[PDB]
Write a protein that binds this ligand. Sequence first.
Ligand SMILES: Nc1ncnc2c1ncn2[C@@H]1O[C@H](COP(=O)(O)O)[C@@H](O)[C@H]1O
Ligand SMILES: Nc1ncnc2c1ncn2[C@@H]1O[C@H](COP(=O)(O)O)[C@@H](O)[C@H]1O
Lengths: 431, 423
Amino acid sequence: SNAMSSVVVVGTQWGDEGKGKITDFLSEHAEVVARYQGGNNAGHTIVFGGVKYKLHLIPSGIFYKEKICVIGNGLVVDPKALLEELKYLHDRGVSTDNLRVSNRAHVILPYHLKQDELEEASKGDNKIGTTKKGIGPAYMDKAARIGIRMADLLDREAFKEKLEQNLAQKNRLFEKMYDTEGFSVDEIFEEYFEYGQQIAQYVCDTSVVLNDALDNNHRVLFEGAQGVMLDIDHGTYPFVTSSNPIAGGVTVGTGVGPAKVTRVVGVCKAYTSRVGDGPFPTELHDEIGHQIREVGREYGTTTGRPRRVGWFDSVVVRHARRVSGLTDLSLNSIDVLTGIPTLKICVAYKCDGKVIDEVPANLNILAKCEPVCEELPGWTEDITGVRSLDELPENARKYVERVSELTGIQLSMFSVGPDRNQTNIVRNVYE
Amino acid sequence: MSSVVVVGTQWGDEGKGKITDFLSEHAEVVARYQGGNNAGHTIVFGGVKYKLHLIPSGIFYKEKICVIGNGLVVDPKALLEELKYLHDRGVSTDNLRVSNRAHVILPYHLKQDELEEASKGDNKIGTTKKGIGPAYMDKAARIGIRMADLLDREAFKEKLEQNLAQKNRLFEKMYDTEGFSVDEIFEEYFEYGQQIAQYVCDTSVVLNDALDNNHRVLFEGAQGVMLDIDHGTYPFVTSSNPIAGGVTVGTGVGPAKVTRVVGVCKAYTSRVGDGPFPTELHDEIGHQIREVGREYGTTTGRPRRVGWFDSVVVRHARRVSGLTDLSLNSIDVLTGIPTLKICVAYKCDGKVIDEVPANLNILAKCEPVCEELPGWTEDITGVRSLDELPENARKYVERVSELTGIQLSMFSVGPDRNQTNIV
Ligand SMILES: Nc1ncnc2c1ncn2[C@@H]1O[C@H](COP(=O)(O)O)[C@@H](O)[C@H]1O
Ligand SMILES: Nc1ncnc2c1ncn2[C@@H]1O[C@H](COP(=O)(O)O)[C@@H](O)[C@H]1O
């Protein structure tokens, strides 16, 4: 490229914004694609070359042999899950020579999965509704500075020593705090060290990889997981994930300076959803909510568990604009709102009679926020083949325009269906 | 826009304060973004010395907004002690803003820090014993209490009860020791919160309002790159991100909102705590550096570890923190050493590398590969520019720049404001 070209794709809501197909789309012209936080709690389905894939840890660019795909230091990586994903790709003829895994990423082990389950049980009605993938406990071990990293996993002596130290504490935790069974040093070592040996070929300093690309004008794309409202700092704490999905997470999570990001695409669904527990001011429980859930396919891919759905919440997206420095808006799933005569967009919260434009930091106060909404007329046309704003039925265009007006973010892309070819470009985010 | 971050490139003892104090003069907002009261330096303002820890260095200018961002862990007791300290000395703090999303350090965090350290035996981290790590662990666990919670009497009481039930069982079962009653903590700390409440707000709004209105913002780093939880000498690190990237997550600003990152390094290296330190000195030269550089705990008088300048570390920092320029401090400390050394690479298994290894075992075995330079004997504490230096001092400074690949912006030859000079 002419000059530095670096784009971050972030979810502006509580995950499931449709970031996956937007990253897939932007991947087409990127040279490097990088994850920067989270673990296998992430995921999106892609049908590539007529074959269905669901990636959880591996970045979107993997399907293109010539694009470098980076798992940054900011992630928590379950080696077993990573190898299952690699095998799935390989069995379908996808090479993964282009994968790069940070030597400083943290490693999720079986005790993290059990700790996740036990912590959730202990919280009773205050449970977070985590993905049960050990994410929280791995990030806790990182902060505790007892966590095991990829560099350690590759070292026969170091991995054994850290397991011995860690299991000494964790087994006492399980046995004495939770009255349950723990794990075995030797069994975890033998199984997971072998996983490490299969991953070793990809392990390197990924900050060097990304900065070499950035400094030499290669197009770099950063792929966010979860979304701003699940951010450990800026989301609906404690009903959040234990990492930073905001664009800022790219800097700490890959080792790049903050000025090395040129554009931040905030991906918003035309309505909102939550998978786990916690406040959700615009949540719906009516026939419209059911229609949105059904048409939007808002169910767990694996479990079929219904997600919570609600009207678009512009308070949340204006919050995301600020804390994540959003420069560009991608509005997805507009087709899901087809056939609903009156649509609503939440423009403010009412909190004990007081109308506010902020997400309160105090959960008890946020839990009291009632949505204050504008109503907009809907449309009946099938818009799943539409190619431009001009082509949209008047009311659908007005709805799209109103989202950009209310959020203060210029529209750069919109999507009218779940497929990659249903993404329409309004503005180029690469220069 | 003007939005500058001052970051330490070593292990937190780089003389960041000299640079922050100078740059604060023309900033309109000064913001901390990570860490807690495990920070601070002596500020000279109007000729008067002040020592702070949590409060940003711009507090003395009534017209400058000072922000404690969401990324910090805040001991309310310690914060109030600092507030009273300033008020007793005639300094107003109306300009302080405290994030409603910053996490709160409570007495059980301090005990937990001590217990964890004991449990690690010879592998202890050598923490500052201020409860920093345990507070960041509770954050990741999502059980941590934030400033907004502290201000809510019933919610604070409920979270204290929940957390103490867990922590007390933790201390009993894991550490064979007693914990705390709710009574021991509740009223005392709730009252601290009530005295801080006047400052509590959305600090992301404060910072973005300033940025979007072309006000100059200065972000004040604590610790240094080699103590970074991700990029430092893990696990011998602090539990936050001192790198420039930490400002984004730690204050809620987008990455492209930072325009300049000033890396600060000393002309030699130092560590306060435990862990690898490839260029560490255990000889007469080491003592001279510690003595002249006054490298001792400000409160305990505990000596710090010192060593030669390490350019591998600073090149690492250049990359992971996106350094735009470099300030080189305490050059005067190297006076009177006949042969100076700068580490340009590491030797491990006789293999020469230009990287900081992620693997602790490899790092612990890295031997420094050094270039040797002739020293000087003259007093350089009075110079205002590089061309006033003795030849060998100027050459030393030039080589640091050449080896790190970073342009020099400032240098210092003393503790005073007039001993920090532009390049
Ligand atoms: N890929 C995802 N999509 C939507 N929500 C998620 C995702 N990953 C985590 N979460 C949510 O983040 C919170 C914490 O889960 P975990 O990240 O497993 O600790 C819960 O509310 C989850 O439902
Ligand atoms: N202000 C500081 N200056 C130098 N080293 C520090 C500072 N704060 C923390 N550290 C180091 O960071 C590590 C973790 O300490 P803590 O931040 O208390 O968890 C130890 O090596 C400390 O010596």
